[PDB]
């Protein structure tokens, strides 16, 4: 049985990592009903968008949502993890970020307080994540210049 | 139209709405949305993961 | 299948249709399914009158 959207937000990181598809779905099934415009097709043409800037304003909100999706898919793309929800990398874990052991992290902490504890070094980790790939780019570069 | 046993049946030039004029030229066209996602069995499995 | 329809002229008319497109071969007669004094008969000619 599945706890529902964001159900494991108070669960251990391992339990939420088991239901990450659940959190992944609310990125799409909020935006499937709005792009549908099936219940919007007939109601006063296109919900009277003439002299109603809330209609455009509403539309701009829909744009922000798909724009955020594109930000996350871009990050998964430049880290070579586009197709997968869980991917391992080559970046070693610098201990200065967090000193907690594996058992304490995955069976004693929630993703919220973890993201709060590591929000300080997120940019650095992303930099290593954008950098580390670059050594794969370079190995492919060796295969390119023969 | 009038059930008079085929006696009455008179056709007058109505002054119908303009949408009927659009229907007169849109009779051949139709709008559809593409659902490009199909799933089918071919008895092949991705055993290996990653 | 087409990306865009053919050129449709927005001819404002009420009794007779003007400057439209002609059905090929025989003329065409269009009513709804019920056909009993309730709809509006649409006629598309094969030869245009001037």
């Amino acid at each position: 049985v599945f706890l529902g959207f964001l159900g494991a937000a108070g669960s251990t990181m391992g339990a939420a990592s088991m239901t990450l598809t659940v959190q992944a779905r609310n990125l799409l099934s909020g935006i499937v009903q709005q792009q549908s415009n099936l219940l919007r097709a007939p109601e006063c043409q296109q919900h009277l968008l003439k002299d109603t800037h809330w209609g455009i304003k509403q539309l701009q909100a829909r744009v922000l949502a798909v724009e955020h999706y594109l930000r996350d898919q871009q990050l998964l793309g430049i880290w070579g993890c586009s197709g997968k929800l869980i991917c391992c990398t080559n970046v070693p874990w610098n201990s200065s970020w967090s000193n907690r052991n594996l058992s304490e992290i995955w069976d004693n902490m929630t993703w919220l307080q973890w993201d709060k504890e590591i929000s300080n070094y997120t940019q650095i980790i992303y930099g290593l994540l954008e950098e580390s790939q670059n050594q794969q780019e370079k190995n492919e570069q060796d295969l390119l210049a023969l | 139209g009038g059930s008079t046993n085929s006696t009455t049946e008179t056709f007058r030039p109505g002054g119908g709405d303009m949408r009927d004029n659009w229907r007169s030229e849109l009779y051949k066209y139709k709008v559809v949305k593409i659902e490009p996602l199909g799933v089918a069995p071919t008895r092949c499995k991705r055993r290996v993961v990653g | 299948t087409v990306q865009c329809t053919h050129g449709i002229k927005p001819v404002v008319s009420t009794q007779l249709l003007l400057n439209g497109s002609l059905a090929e071969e025989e003329v065409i007669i269009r009513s709804e399914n019920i056909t009993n004094n309730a709809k509006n008969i649409l006629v598309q000619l094969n030869t245009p009158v001037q």
Partner: antibody
Framework: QVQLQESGPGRVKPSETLSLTCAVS??????????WSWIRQAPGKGLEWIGY???????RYNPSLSSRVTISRNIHERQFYLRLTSMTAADTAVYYC?????????????????????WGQGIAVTVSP | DIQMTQSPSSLSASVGDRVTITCRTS??????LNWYQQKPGKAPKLLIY???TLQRGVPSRFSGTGSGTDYTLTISSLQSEDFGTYYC?????????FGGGTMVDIKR
């Protein structure tokens, strides 16, 4: 809509012409796919649909009184009228104006009423010299 | 043209009874029929403007069924403000017809 004000002469002599007026308040007139009908009811007997005028223009009346009935529609005046020539004592009845919307598309913001949901107050027209 | 008939012509029922009224049409109307209530003296108030679709301001104790040439209005639990004369009307093209009517008073 809810205010269909009727007016006219409740007293008509024989062989004359009966003209009646039905004014609409809620401006549902300008909305398309609306049919505005005139209906009379003889006492004790049933109700008889006289004629209807469409959103484009008055198409049909009742075949019995087809040549002696003319329904007009003054767009901007917000009203629509009925005319009945050669008034006889058999036409002495109670007259109403009623509205109903039929949509071939079923394609609107809300659901419409196929039946006659809007009715006037009724005019009692009597005929005698 | 199309003619309509109601059964019974005069009916006298009690409060709370499941009452039915039959409206027979001469020709197939394709689910196009309306039921109306008229207290004597007032304009006919609309009840059901399709085969089964109820209008608003109307309590839930009313219902209409049927197809083809036979249609039935039904009241599960009658009330006090349900007297008067009831009519049926088809809107299947021009011209429009009305039923004879069903005088419904309270039983005695």
């Amino acid at each position: 809509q809810v205010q269909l004000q009727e007016s006219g002469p409740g007293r008509v002599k024989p062989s004359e012409t009966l003209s009646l007026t039905c004014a609409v308040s809620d401006d549902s007139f300008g909305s398309s796919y609306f049919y505005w009908s005139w209906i009379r009811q003889a006492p004790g007997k049933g109700l008889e649909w006289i004629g209807y005028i469409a959103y484009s223009g008055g198409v049909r009346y009742n075949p019995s009184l087809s040549s002696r009935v003319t329904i007009s529609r003054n767009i901007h005046e917000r009203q629509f009228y009925l005319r009945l020539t050669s008034m006889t004592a058999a036409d002495t009845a109670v007259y109403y104006c009623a509205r109903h919307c039929e949509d071939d598309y079923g394609y609107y913001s809300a659901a419409q009423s196929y039946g006659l949901d809007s009715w006037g107050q009724g005019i009692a027209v009597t005929v005698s010299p | 043209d199309i003619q309509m008939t109601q059964s019974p012509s005069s009916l006298s029922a009690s409060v709370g009874d499941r009452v039915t009224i039959t409206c027979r049409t001469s020709e197939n109307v394709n689910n196009c029929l309306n039921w109306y209530q008229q207290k004597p003296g007032k304009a006919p108030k609309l009840l059901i403007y399709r085969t089964s679709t109820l209008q608003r301001g109307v309590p839930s104790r009313f219902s209409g069924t049927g197809s083809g040439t036979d249609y039935t209005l039904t009241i599960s639990s009658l009330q006090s403000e349900d007297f008067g004369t009831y009519y049926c009307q088809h809107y299947y093209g021009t011209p429009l017809t009305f039923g004879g009517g069903t005088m419904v008073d309270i039983k005695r």
